[PDB]
């Protein structure tokens, strides 16, 4: 109420004859900038805005709208003198033209304004006017609280400063750097927007430091001896070229202390976690004291929509003939009118955030180790995006001028064919073999135009994958590109169905570069490789094994990859020397994750200045463009800090019950029926590489023409590539026809294979937990791995077998028991029942001839443990008091109802 009065009185200090709708106004935006900005949820916002106006029009039921208005409600001293009110379209406009001017200056990156930032700057600003301003900016990272206090200090004039926060960096140098601020602040007569993050402690002896910086503006055990002397020296100096008279030491050491209570002004960014504020209010009070904490909400639907419209303003998705059958809205407010398809990509892909928001949450509620989806992923999204598309239009576009090269090249041959002709059977058959060219090049052509429908969905649902997942399991992936998919199906934006995510993102010879590269042929290995080779957020790669960290070696060996980690002691001389030359550096073990690559991480680098140099740490150091940083871990799951995962892209080689299944079924695949594991690898070759060939071969054809300078007299020369077109496009032909009787037999032997990967799966995570049964039954995935390679490729009892029926059969049950005897072998004599039957259950749950008596298993587990004790008393002479009360619990049992 105190702050409430001295903001009405400074809001009314030069401003006169205001009515009461002015005084009522000025009375409602204090009350939203000191009630409403610290609220949480919506709600409480909402809340805040109907009580507000409920009470004003209660104690003043005599006044004008002239109150509210519109909602935002805005005051600005920028457009005038005084503290007026001004319009939202007016102040947006203002702080476009500010931000040319700050672009000029530095942090060229583009920032579309929507109404929430116009009200942060402005209550930054507010805070930022009052000489003891302090600030607690908390927001989800990518928000863009540092990016907006920075804009809104620099437009104010204010001197930003920051700490370089390392694992080595000591409270000694803390209090030295805090002797610098506060020597700037103090002497020389600088406001300085000093700002600090959560990463930027380690210690909290900084934040006793700042309980005083901020509760009484003076650090008592900060300056002693030669800096105490050193200082007095300078600030007397500073109060002489300032006007201000030289006194004792103490009322100078008073003064400066005044001085730096009007010149400094500290910002504290922190994550909307409450768990870690409810001790950052034990361990400085002066947290909720001197600062005016300002809670930074996740960027709304709005804005996640006008990022999406602004940022996709480069490419040209303008679709004239677009149909629009349904209503699937979410922005919900501006522009729902038919769109342009514009709006539909924008729409698309602001319902991709949501539906990870959904999947976070759902994945919260059934379990836990949950990532929160911070708003720069929207932003590498959008990146990834625009460079996919670039990319995927670029060379279609590059190989349909080819294609009309190609056929301009035929034309010329046709023209020296009629010259020549004025032998005939050569000229014949060329004539025919020709126009079944033009034919089969048009055809070509109207393909070219059909897949410019399919690019942008495609390209869409390609980089929603890959910037977004990464960290799920192949389960998850699957779940989020078809929700994804049938979304897009839904809002009619035209993609190719059945989409190979492996073979649109990436092309033969670099799949089977990686596969030499020690990379398993595993389809969720294939994703991480693709995620792997394009990124904009350098790759953490989570393996519980070594064999994401042997590939990616593999893959730069020619590019002098150093290996080094967090826990080496050289690890910044191990990267300084990497970032100078030019050469990629894995850093393993990021548990331990040094501060000091938030700047590389960030990609903050100043390429203002002549040379592209980092503010790596104290020096600054030229960042060579093949500096390609890495991430990796040794664990399965943990949790890991809301500021690193918004700046690494989460790339996931755990392993999982569907990651099982799926390597399961295609070993089997492989192994049994290998017609069909051929059949759908033409298929996945289908899309692009056997186009690719088809352009090989296209291009030799194209060479030989000019080779050969349309030679009749040998024509065989070039009749035999044109037959070997001609049957290379009858093949590819028949393969696509085929693609309806394919994948309709392919996912019926699928899932006649089904039940095997399953109870694979299930095995080999019971095996896995048995660890709980005793601390000696461990086992690695390789064991496990050893037991079906053997069940497959040694079994005895699969020599003779032929039949498909039959040897499925056989090699399951040979599973089973070769399971059973790997396992048991190294289990006490008191669980192999337990584990044998453990294996009956999920045969049980594998076969279909029964039900799955979940009930039964149930109540022979847990049930007889249900609390009664009616009827409890026996009554044959043949039956004692526990079996009956047993006789009553089986009585429980539907199928025991008359015992
Ligand atoms: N209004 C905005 N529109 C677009 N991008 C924005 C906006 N605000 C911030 N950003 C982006 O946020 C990134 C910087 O986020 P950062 O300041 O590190 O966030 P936080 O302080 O929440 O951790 C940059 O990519 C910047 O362009």
Same mark, same amino acid.
């Given at each position: 109420?105190?702050?409430?009065?001295?903001?009405?009185?400074?809001?009314?200090?030069?401003?006169?004859?205001?009515?009461?709708?002015?005084?009522?106004?000025?009375?409602?935006?204090?009350?939203?900038?000191?009630?409403?900005?610290?609220?949480?949820?919506?709600?409480?916002?909402?809340?805040?805005?109907?009580?507000?106006?409920?009470?004003?029009?209660?104690?003043?039921?005599?006044?004008?709208?002239?109150?509210?208005?519109?909602?935002?409600?805005?005051?600005?001293?920028?457009?005038?003198?005084?503290?007026?009110?001004?319009?939202?379209?007016?102040?947006?406009?203002?702080?476009?033209?500010?931000?040319?001017?700050?672009?000029?200056?530095?942090?060229?990156?583009?920032?579309?304004?929507?109404?929430?930032?116009?009200?942060?700057?402005?209550?930054?600003?507010?805070?930022?006017?009052?000489?003891?301003?302090?600030?607690?900016?908390?927001?989800?990272?990518?928000?863009?609280?540092?990016?907006?206090?920075?804009?809104?200090?620099?437009?104010?004039?204010?001197?930003?400063?920051?700490?370089?926060?390392?694992?080595?960096?000591?409270?000694?140098?803390?209090?030295?750097?805090?002797?610098?601020?506060?020597?700037?602040?103090?002497?020389?007569?600088?406001?300085?927007?000093?700002?600090?993050?959560?990463?930027?402690?380690?210690?909290?002896?900084?934040?006793?430091?700042?309980?005083?910086?901020?509760?009484?503006?003076?650090?008592?055990?900060?300056?002693?001896?030669?800096?105490?002397?050193?200082?007095?020296?300078?600030?007397?100096?500073?109060?002489?070229?300032?006007?201000?008279?030289?006194?004792?030491?103490?009322?100078?050491?008073?003064?400066?202390?005044?001085?730096?209570?009007?010149?400094?002004?500290?910002?504290?960014?922190?994550?909307?976690?409450?768990?870690?504020?409810?001790?950052?209010?034990?361990?400085?009070?002066?947290?909720?004291?001197?600062?005016?904490?300002?809670?930074?909400?996740?960027?709304?639907?709005?804005?996640?929509?006008?990022?999406?419209?602004?940022?996709?303003?480069?490419?040209?998705?303008?679709?004239?003939?677009?149909?629009?059958?349904?209503?699937?809205?979410?922005?919900?407010?501006?522009?729902?009118?038919?769109?342009?398809?514009?709006?539909?990509?924008?729409?698309?892909?602001?319902?991709?955030?949501?539906?990870?928001?959904?999947?976070?949450?759902?994945?919260?509620?059934?379990?836990?180790?949950?990532?929160?989806?911070?708003?720069?992923?929207?932003?590498?999204?959008?990146?990834?995006?625009?460079?996919?598309?670039?990319?995927?239009?670029?060379?279609?576009?590059?190989?349909?001028?080819?294609?009309?090269?190609?056929?301009?090249?035929?034309?010329?041959?046709?023209?020296?064919?009629?010259?020549?002709?004025?032998?005939?059977?050569?000229?014949?058959?060329?004539?025919?073999?020709?126009?079944?060219?033009?034919?089969?090049?048009?055809?070509?052509?109207?393909?070219?135009?059909?897949?410019?429908?399919?690019?942008?969905?495609?390209?869409?649902?390609?980089?929603?994958?890959?910037?977004?997942?990464?960290?799920?399991?192949?389960?998850?992936?699957?779940?989020?590109?078809?929700?994804?998919?049938?979304?897009?199906?839904?809002?009619?934006?035209?993609?190719?169905?059945?989409?190979?995510?492996?073979?649109?993102?990436?092309?033969?010879?670099?799949?089977?570069?990686?596969?030499?590269?020690?990379?398993?042929?595993?389809?969720?290995?294939?994703?991480?490789?693709?995620?792997?080779?394009?990124?904009?957020?350098?790759?953490?790669?989570?393996?519980?094994?070594?064999?994401?960290?042997?590939?990616?070696?593999?893959?730069?060996?020619?590019?002098?990859?150093?290996?080094?980690?967090?826990?080496?002691?050289?690890?910044?001389?191990?990267?300084?020397?990497?970032?100078?030359?030019?050469?990629?550096?894995?850093?393993?073990?990021?548990?331990?994750?040094?501060?000091?690559?938030?700047?590389?991480?960030?990609?903050?680098?100043?390429?203002?200045?002549?040379?592209?140099?980092?503010?790596?740490?104290?020096?600054?150091?030229?960042?060579?463009?093949?500096?390609?940083?890495?991430?990796?871990?040794?664990?399965?799951?943990?949790?890991?800090?809301?500021?690193?995962?918004?700046?690494?892209?989460?790339?996931?080689?755990?392993?999982?019950?569907?990651?099982?299944?799926?390597?399961?079924?295609?070993?089997?695949?492989?192994?049994?029926?290998?017609?069909?594991?051929?059949?759908?690898?033409?298929? #996945? /070759?289908?899309?692009?590489?056997?186009?690719? !060939? =088809?352009?090989?071969?296209? %291009?030799? *054809?194209? $060479?030989?023409?000019?080779?050969?300078?349309?030679?009749?007299?040998?024509?065989?020369?070039?009749?035999?590539?044109?037959?070997?077109?001609?049957?290379?496009?009858?093949?590819?032909?028949?393969?696509?026809?085929?693609?309806?009787?394919?994948?309709?037999?392919?996912?019926?032997?699928?899932?006649?294979?089904?039940?095997?990967?399953?109870?694979?799966?299930?095995?080999?995570?019971?095996?896995?937990?048995?660890?709980?049964?005793?601390?000696?039954?461990?086992?690695?995935?390789?064991?496990?791995?050893?037991?079906?390679?053997?069940?497959?490729?040694?079994?005895?009892? #699969? /020599?003779?077998?032929?039949?498909?029926?039959? !040897? =499925?059969?056989?090699?399951? %049950?040979? *599973?089973? $028991?070769?399971?059973?005897?790997?396992?048991?072998?190294?289990?006490?004599?008191?669980?192999?029942?337990?584990?044998?039957?453990?294996?009956?259950?999920?045969?049980?749950?594998?076969?279909?001839?029964?039900?799955?008596?979940?009930?039964?298993?149930?109540?022979?587990?847990?049930?007889?443990?249900?609390?009664?004790?009616?009827?409890?008393?026996?009554?044959?002479?043949?039956?004692?008091?526990?079996?009956?009360?047993?006789?009553?619990?089986?009585?429980?049992?539907?199928?025991?109802?008359?015992?």
């Amino acid at each position: 109420m105190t702050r409430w009065v001295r903001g009405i009185f400074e809001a009314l200090r030069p401003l006169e004859t205001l009515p009461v709708e002015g005084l009522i106004r000025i009375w409602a935006h204090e009350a939203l900038r000191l009630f409403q900005d610290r609220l949480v949820e919506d709600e409480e916002r909402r809340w805040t805005d109907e009580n507000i106006d409920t009470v004003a029009l209660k104690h003043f039921p005599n006044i004008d709208r002239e109150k509210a208005m519109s909602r935002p409600i805005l005051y600005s001293n920028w457009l005038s003198k005084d503290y007026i009110p001004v319009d939202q379209e007016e102040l947006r406009d203002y702080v476009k033209a500010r931000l040319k001017v700050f672009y000029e200056e530095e942090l060229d990156v583009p920032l579309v304004l929507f109404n929430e930032v116009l009200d942060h700057v402005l209550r930054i600003d507010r805070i930022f006017r009052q000489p003891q301003g302090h600030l607690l900016l908390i927001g989800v990272s990518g928000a863009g609280k540092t990016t907006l206090s920075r804009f809104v200090a620099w437009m104010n004039g204010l001197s930003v400063y920051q700490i370089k926060v390392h694992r080595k960096y000591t409270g000694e140098d803390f209090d030295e750097d805090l002797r610098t601020v506060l020597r700037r602040s103090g002497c020389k007569n600088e406001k300085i927007a000093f700002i600090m993050d959560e990463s930027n402690v380690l210690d909290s002896g900084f934040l006793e430091r700042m309980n005083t910086l901020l509760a009484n503006g003076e650090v008592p055990g900060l300056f002693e001896g030669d800096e105490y002397a050193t200082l007095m020296t300078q600030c007397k100096e500073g109060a002489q070229k300032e006007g201000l008279m030289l006194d004792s030491h103490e009322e100078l050491y008073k003064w400066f202390t005044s001085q730096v209570i009007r010149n400094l002004h500290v910002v504290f960014t922190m994550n909307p976690s409450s768990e870690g504020l409810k001790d950052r209010a034990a361990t400085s009070p002066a947290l909720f004291n001197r600062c005016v904490l300002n809670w930074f909400g996740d960027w709304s639907t709005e804005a996640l929509y006008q990022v999406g419209k602004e940022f996709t303003s480069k490419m040209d998705l303008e679709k004239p003939n677009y149909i629009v059958p349904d209503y699937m809205p979410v922005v919900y407010d501006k522009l729902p009118q038919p769109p342009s398809h514009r709006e539909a990509i924008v729409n698309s892909c602001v319902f991709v955030h949501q539906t990870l928001h959904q999947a976070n949450a759902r994945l919260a509620k059934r379990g836990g180790r949950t990532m929160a989806i911070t708003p720069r992923h929207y932003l590498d999204f959008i990146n990834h995006y625009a460079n996919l598309f670039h990319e995927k239009r670029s060379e279609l576009e590059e190989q349909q001028m080819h294609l009309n090269v190609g056929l301009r090249k035929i034309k010329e041959t046709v023209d020296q064919v009629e010259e020549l002709r004025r032998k005939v059977n050569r000229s014949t058959a060329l004539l025919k073999s020709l126009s079944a060219e033009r034919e089969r090049w048009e055809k070509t052509s109207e393909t070219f135009k059909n897949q410019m429908s399919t690019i942008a969905g495609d390209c869409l649902l390609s980089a929603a994958f890959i910037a977004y997942a990464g960290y799920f399991d192949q389960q998850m992936r699957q779940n989020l590109f078809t929700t994804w998919s049938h979304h897009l199906q839904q809002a009619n934006i035209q993609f190719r169905t059945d989409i190979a995510r492996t073979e649109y993102l990436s092309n033969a010879d670099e799949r089977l570069r990686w596969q030499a590269s020690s990379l398993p042929a595993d389809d969720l290995c294939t994703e991480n490789a693709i995620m792997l080779k394009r990124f904009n957020r350098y790759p953490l790669i989570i393996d519980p094994s070594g064999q994401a960290t042997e590939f990616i070696m593999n893959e730069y060996k020619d590019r002098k990859i150093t290996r080094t980690s967090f826990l080496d002691d050289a690890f910044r001389k191990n990267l300084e020397s990497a970032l100078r030359f030019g050469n990629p550096l894995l850093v393993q073990d990021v548990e331990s994750y040094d501060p000091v690559l938030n700047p590389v991480l960030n990609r903050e680098v100043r390429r203002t200045g002549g040379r592209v140099l980092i503010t790596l740490g104290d020096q600054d150091i030229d960042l060579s463009p093949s500096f390609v940083i890495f991430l990796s871990t040794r664990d399965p799951t943990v949790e890991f800090p809301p500021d690193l995962c918004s700046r690494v892209t989460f790339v996931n080689f755990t392993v999982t019950r569907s990651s099982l299944q799926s390597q399961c079924l295609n070993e089997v695949l492989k192994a049994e029926r290998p017609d069909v594991d051929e059949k759908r690898s033409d298929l #996945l /070759k289908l899309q692009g590489e056997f186009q690719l !060939r =088809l352009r090989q071969l296209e %291009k030799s *054809l194209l $060479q030989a023409l000019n080779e050969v300078k349309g030679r009749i007299l040998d024509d065989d020369t070039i009749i035999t590539t044109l037959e070997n077109l001609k049957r290379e496009a009858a093949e590819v032909t028949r393969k696509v026809e085929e693609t309806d009787i394919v994948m309709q037999e392919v996912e019926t032997v699928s899932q006649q294979y089904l039940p095997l990967s399953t109870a694979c799966s299930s095995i080999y995570f019971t095996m896995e937990s048995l660890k709980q049964i005793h601390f000696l039954y461990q086992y690695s995935l390789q064991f496990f791995l050893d037991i079906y390679h053997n069940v497959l490729y040694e079994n005895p009892n #699969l /020599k003779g077998v032929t039949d498909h029926t039959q !040897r =499925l059969s056989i090699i399951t %049950k040979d *599973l089973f $028991q070769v399971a059973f005897n790997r396992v048991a072998r190294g289990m006490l004599h008191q669980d192999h029942i337990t584990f044998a039957m453990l294996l009956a259950r999920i045969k049980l749950k594998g076969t279909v001839g029964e039900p799955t008596y979940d009930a039964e298993f149930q109540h022979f587990l847990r049930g007889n443990e249900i609390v009664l004790s009616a009827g409890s008393t026996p009554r044959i002479q043949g039956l004692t008091v526990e079996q009956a009360e047993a006789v009553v619990r089986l009585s429980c049992l539907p199928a025991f109802k008359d015992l």
